[PDB]
Structure 1
Amino acid sequence: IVGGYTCGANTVPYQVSLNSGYHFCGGSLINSQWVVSAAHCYKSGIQVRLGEDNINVVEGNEQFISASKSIVHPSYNSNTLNNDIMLIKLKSAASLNSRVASISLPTSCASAGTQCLISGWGNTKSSGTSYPDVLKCLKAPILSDSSCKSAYPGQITSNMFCAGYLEGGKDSCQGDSGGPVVCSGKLQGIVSWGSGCAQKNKPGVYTKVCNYVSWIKQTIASN
C-alpha cells in the first residue's frame, strides 16, 4: 500500500497472509474454512496465516493453517487477468474470534463513489521498494467505469473496477495482490493489477467480487 496508514494490530480481522516460506499475497477469510484471493496468486504449498499484524514476528493472535486445495476460477485468463479470483480451502477450520473473523460476500455490487478499505503488506513506495512488516490500510473510492476505461484503454472488462485516486500518491502495490477491498462491511474487490503504483491516471484495478458470489457459494457447497 502506497500512501496509506498503519491499520493497527488485528483491526482488519478478515485479512490473511498467504505464505510459501514468505508472504507473497493477501487474501480474505470468507468463512471458517475458506479464503478468497486473486487467481494470479495461485501456487502450490500455500500456508494461510490468520490473525497477523507483523508478519515477521509471532505476536500471539496468529493461526497458521495449510491449504488443502486451491480452486482458480474456470475462466481465469492470466494474460488479460479477466476473472482474477481463486478460492483456497483450509485443512482445518479457523477458530473465529474478534481478531480472526470472516468478511461477508456482497449481496449487491458497490457503485462508483463508494468509499472502501484496501489493505495489505505490499510495497509502500511508488518508485523504490520497501516492504512493511505490519498491515497497511488505505481508504479509497470506487471510480466510475468510464474513468477506469479511459485510464486503461482496451483492458477493463465487466469483471473489473478501478479504485483510488487519479492524481496518484495513494494506491495498492506489489504484495497487496489478492487482498481485500471492503465497502460497508462487504468484500467488493480483490487486489488484481495496475500499471506501477500510485502513478498519475493509473489507479488500482480490482476483481469485481459481486459477479462471483454464485460461483463462490456453489463451489464452497460442493468442496
Structure 2
Amino acid sequence: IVGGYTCGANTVPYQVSLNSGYHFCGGSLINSQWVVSAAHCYKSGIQVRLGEDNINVVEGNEQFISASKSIVHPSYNSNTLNNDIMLIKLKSAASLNSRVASISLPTSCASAGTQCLISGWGNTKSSGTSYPDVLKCLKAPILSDSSCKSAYPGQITSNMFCAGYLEGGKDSCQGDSGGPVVCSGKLQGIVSWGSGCAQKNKPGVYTKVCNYVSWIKQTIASN
C-alpha cells in the first residue's frame, strides 16, 4: 500500500496472508474453510495465515492452516488477467473470533464514487522498495468505468474496475496481490494489477467480485 496508514492490529480480521516460506499474496476469509484471492496468486505449498498483523512476529492471535484445495477461475486468462479470482479451501476450519472473521460477499455490484477499504502487506513506495511487516490500509473511491478504460486502453474487461486517485500518491502495490477491496461490508474487489504503483493516471485495477458470487457460492457448496 502506497500513501496509506497502519490499519492497527487485527482491525481487518478478514485479511489473510498467503505464505509459501514468506508472505507472497493477500486474501479474504469468506467463511471458516474458504479464502478468496487472485488467480495470479496461484501456486502450491500455500499456508493460509489468519489473525496476523506483523507477519514477521508471532503476536498470539495467529492461525496457520494449510490449503487442501486451490480452484482458479475456469476462465482465468494470465495474459490479460481477465477473471483474476481463486478460491482456497483450508485443510481444517479456522476458529472464528474477533480477530479471525469472514467478510460478506456482495449481493450487488458497487458503483463509481463508492468509498472502499484496501489493505495489504505490499510495497509502500511508488519509486524503489519498502515492505512493512504490519498491515497497511487505504481509503479509495471506485472510479468511473470510462476513466478506468481511458487510463488503460484495451486492457479493462467488465470483470475489472479501477479504484484510487488519478492524481496518484495512493494505491495498492506488489505484495497486496489477491487482497481485499471492501465497500459497505462487502468484498467487491481483489488486488489484481496496475502500471507501477500510485503513479499519475495509473489507478489500481481490481477483480470485480459481484460478477463471481454465483460461481463462489456454487463452488463452496460443491467442494
Please state which band the TM-score falls in when normalised by the shorter chain.
over 0.9
Q: CA deviation at 1:134?
A: 0.1
Distance 1:148 1:90 in 2: 35
Q: CA deviation at 1:129?
A: 0.3
State the Cα deviation string for residues 66-96 of structure 1 (Å, max 9, x = none): 0001000000000000000000000000000
Distance 2:164 2:124 in 1: 15
Distance 1:100 1:183 in 2: 19
SS of match in other structure, 1:65: strand
State the Cα deviation string for residues 150-202 of structure 1 (Å, max 9, x = none): 00000000000000000000000000000000000100000000000000000
Distance 1:198 1:89 in 2: 33
SS of match in other structure, 1:218: helix
> Where do residues 175-190 of structure 1 align in structure 2 (5 Å cutoff)?
175-190=175-190
SS of match in other structure, 2:216: helix
Q: CA RMSD in A?
A: 0.2
Distance 1:32 1:180 in 2: 17
State the Cα deviation string for residues 37-87 of structure 1 (Å, max 9, x = none): 000000000000000000000000000000001000000000000000000
State the Cα deviation string for residues 121-152 of structure 1 (Å, max 9, x = none): 00000001000000000000000000000000
Aligned to 1:119: 119
Q: CA deviation at 1:21?
A: 0.2
Q: Provide structure 2 residue ranges, at least 5 long, that are not aligned to the other structure.
A: none
Distance 2:84 2:128 in 1: 26
TM-score normalised over the length of structure 1: 1.00
Distance 2:139 2:128 in 1: 22
Q: CA deviation at 1:32?
A: 0.3
Q: Provide structure 1 residue ranges, at least 5 long, that are not aligned to the other structure.
A: none
Q: How many residues align?
A: 223
Aligned to 1:13: 13
TM-score normalised over the length of structure 2: 1.00
